[PDB]
Structure formats: C-alpha cells, structure tokens
Design a protein around this ligand. Structure first.
Ligand SMILES: [Fe+3]
Length: 317
C-alpha cells in the first residue's frame, strides 16, 4: 500500500521509475530527497520510529555509513543475487548497487589543451596545475569516496598530500556540483574538472539548450589507465531496519534491477547498468572503453572516516 523512500539521488529520471513502480504494483511511493548526510542523521534520530522503508544513495560510502550506524536490515533475494555481481553488493546483504558511475577528469575538447601530464588522480595535486582545477566540496559523497579510494590504494600520506595539493590548485572555491564544475570548463574558468561520467550524458541530452552547449564541450580523461584504472562508485539501495512495509521494500529493490529499469538508468540517466545483459545507451558508448579500478567498493568505504578527517585537516569545507 505505501512505501517510504529516503533518497540522496538527485535525478529527474527517478520520477519516471517510481511512477512505473506505482503503476505496476499499486503501491504509493512517498519519496523524500535530501543530502545523504541529512538523511543519515535523520534515520539515526528517528531510529526504530522512522517511517522510512528504503535508503537510496548515489555513493557506496553513504550505504556503508548507514550500515555501520545500525540503520539497515538484510535482504536475501534470489533476484538481486542473480543479477548483481557479489563485488557490487554487501556480503552481509544490507546494501546493493543499482548502477555504476566513474569519476573522471573532464577537459574542454574545443580547446587545444595538453593532457599528456594529466593522466592519474595524483596529477590533480601537482604544482603545474595550480589554478587550473575545479572540484566540488570535500563534504560531497563523490569527493569523500574518491579520497577514501586514494587512501585504500596509495595510503594516508599520499591521500593527505593529494588533498592539500588539490585544495591549493583550485581555480575557485567549490561552487555547486559536478554540472557547475563542467560549466566552469566550458566557460574557460578552469582547464580540468573532477566529475562523474553520467553528468556529461545528462548535459549533452538536456532539454535545456545551455546544458547541451556545456556537455558538448567536454572531453574525458579516464584516470590511471597506465596502472590501476579509473575510480568506480555506485548508486545503491538498502532496506532500513525501521521498515514496516518490508514486502514493498523488497519488491522495489528488485524492481530497480529489472530489465526495463536498468535500461532507463542508462538511456535516461547515462549511468552504467549493473546487469550484464543491458546494452549501454549510445551516449554512454561514446564515453569510450576504459580500465576500471578492481578494488572492491566495500574496501574503499572502509576508509571513509579517515577521508573526512584528512579533508578537514588540510583546510576544506
Ligand atoms: Fe550524481
């Protein structure tokens, strides 16, 4: 009858998906969108009394934070286990990926720009790029999880040095999110933006012609192709321990991995599907092929607390 979703996703495509669920099942969805940090705090304070049934994020670490705050409940679904690879879901069955996305370095391909020395995440922190980089706030999930991945791969001293150098190199204080950083590259205010791949698709296919202009100017560097490969993060989903509509919650989680919905996620939101039998949308194919970091996303997320402290220490936020 009702299903209460707390979502840190921030996409128009989700509205269509939810309508399709309502149409299919007759269940009314109450959709609450806010920042992940706000939702996790809210879930903690509301506790067992929360009306929430579902927590959706655009980030692995937010799911693990929620798990480790005792806020989620395990789901044993043959459907989810068949179609989500084990490396993309919790061993303890409390969180499950619905998409993949890659955090890349974007440049203005309508300029002559030498990208030969901007090859790895490490390079963003190099003195030669002072004043040439833009990135959103350190408090953003994408930023926290990227730094956590650097800790996991290269250690906490490289992480701190990276964070410090990135801060020093920013063309501007962080101003809005990925699409705003992309506009700064379009406008020539910075040479390189740290951003997720799907935003390039959203922009290029936008019904707002100004978004199309921005998206059309972007080239992609997939970082670290000569070594470990590019940072992958997930959007994902969990049932809350507070859930009183558990059947609906499980139905919704399975619906997010259904063929039609995985196709919408790539066709309409330009993300990578989790299912291995869903063709990429043509825009996403145009991003190109690339090497992905093989690290389990769960292992990245083990470093989230320290990532927060490092960004705080070097002077973000
Ligand atoms: Fe996003």
């Amino acid at each position: 009858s009702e299903l209460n979703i707390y979502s840190a996703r921030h996409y128009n495509a989700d509205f269509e998906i939810i309508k399709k669920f309502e149409e299919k099942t007759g269940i009314k969805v109450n959709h609450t969108q806010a920042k992940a940090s706000e939702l996790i705090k809210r879930l903690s304070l509301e506790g067992s009394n929360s009306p929430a049934d579902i927590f959706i994020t655009a980030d692995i670490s937010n799911l693990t934070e929620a798990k480790n705050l005792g806020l989620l409940s395990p789901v044993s679904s043959k459907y989810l286990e068949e179609f989500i690879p084990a490396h993309l879901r919790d061993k303890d069955k409390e969180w499950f990926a619905i998409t993949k996305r890659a955090r890349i370095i974007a440049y203005n391909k309508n300029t002559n720009i030498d990208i030969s020395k901007m090859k790895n995440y490490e390079d963003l922190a190099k003195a030669e790029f002072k004043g040439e980089i833009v990135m959103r706030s350190a408090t953003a999930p994408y930023s926290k999880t990227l730094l956590a991945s650097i800790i996991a791969n290269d250690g906490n001293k490289e992480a701190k040095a990276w964070a410090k150098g990135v801060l020093e190199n920013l063309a501007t204080n962080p101003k809005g999110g990925d699409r705003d950083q992309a506009r700064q590259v379009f406008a020539g205010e910075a040479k390189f933006a740290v951003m997720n791949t799907y935003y390039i698709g959203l922009l290029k296919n936008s019904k707002n012609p100004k978004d199309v202009e921005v998206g059309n100017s972007l080239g992609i560097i997939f970082p670290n192709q000569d070594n470990r490969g590019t940072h992958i993060n997930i959007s994902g989903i969990a049932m809350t321990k507070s859930s009183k509509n558990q059947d609906a919650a499980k139905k919704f989680m399975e619906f997010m991995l259904s063929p039609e919905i995985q196709k919408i996620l790539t066709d309409s939101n330009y993300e990578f599907p989790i299912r291995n039998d869903v063709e990429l949308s043509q825009t996403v194919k145009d991003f190109g092929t690339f090497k992905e970091d093989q690290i389990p996303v769960s292992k990245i997320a083990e470093n989230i607390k320290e990532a927060v402290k490092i960004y705080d220490e070097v002077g973000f936020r």
